[PDB]
């Protein structure tokens, strides 16, 4: 592998970060010594590995640990915890009974517990009963957050004494997933395959803890041959309201080596912004998430109603919605109002079976004309000559003349009420004939004839004449 190095004593601080207690002390570059905790109460100091570890390759950890100058009976505590978890390179475990492993998720490793915790918290299960007041080295199951000691791995160790450094070797087989830890003559072996659940890259922490009891806890001549894990960029494609719209695109690569992400073209959506990490960058030991936000594409549909008689817009409806959704708009309601008001529908290009908003705009038109109802009014001009005696009694039947009929069209607008009259056409003529008055036997008439009356119009008034007959 290319991502595969050996961390030398002289470069300890390059690859390890002094946290809590340890950050008060400078790595002595003559002894190659790093203080985790001093001989003081309520301490908590760790070294977190800056990178991560490929938990599928072969790593060999070498060094000497000073567990202090006091046993538990003599007021000595708490021990040295080795942490392996899949989480952040900066997350470290709870102190005391959790021994630098408990209270992280997906956590496992090896402790030298120089203090027997018999009373269990929510962060650690009681230490094994077969070790009451006795120092021991053990593997721990920290997956469910609660550090549980593997009672199989529980072998006794030499009490902390005179601040003496004992040899420590932790070796791991990638394919077997088997860890071999040797602390000064005692030897441990455990199958961590159960503990590297799926994630071939784990965070590393060496931690130390004091409480009421205390011990100077240090590390010396550290040698860590391992395969540096690869960084992992994650890329999400989501709408504005969180909901994912495209498959998340998890890449992976050597750290400080370019990663590149891609804006996805997404049917029904336009890119808005990239929240989280840069779309272009370099790879990093913790997991960088580039989200891609998209807007739900909205389509436009308008329906214009036009009075063709005025050539002017009656009303316009504007529908906007998501590319694919139904407007649930009908023209019949807005047509009804108009056809009620005395409009006649000319044309409707709006689809009968509803519309669907699309990426491209939709425009529909409804032409209505002011309804025109052609009527026909008829007028008639009449000539009636009555033939009477001086008493007002009838000498003869009234002559009712061939009537002069007139007719004009009357176009009526049902929207305005306006009446468009045509020209008063004459059906029968303009001239009333001459009417010679009857000759009654033994009478003489005041008018012997009624003269022809011409130039009668539809405006002309009915003629009402009267012939009076005198005796002899
Ligand atoms: Ca303990």
Numbering used by the authors: 40 to 511
Task: Give the article text.
Here, we experimentally clarified the structure and function of the lactococcal cell surface protein YwfG. Amino acid sequence analysis using the Phyre2 and Pfam servers indicated that the 120-kDa protein contained a leguminous-type (L-type) lectin domain (Lec), a mucin-binding protein domain (Mbp), and four mucus-binding protein repeats (MubRs), followed by a C-terminal LPXTG motif. Structural analysis revealed that YwfG28–511 is composed of three different domains: Lec, Mbp, and MubR. Lactococcus lactis G50 YwfG has a Lec domain at the tip of an approximately 600–650-Å long column consisting of one Mbp and four MubRs extending from the cell wall, suggesting that the structure is suitable for binding to distant target glycans.
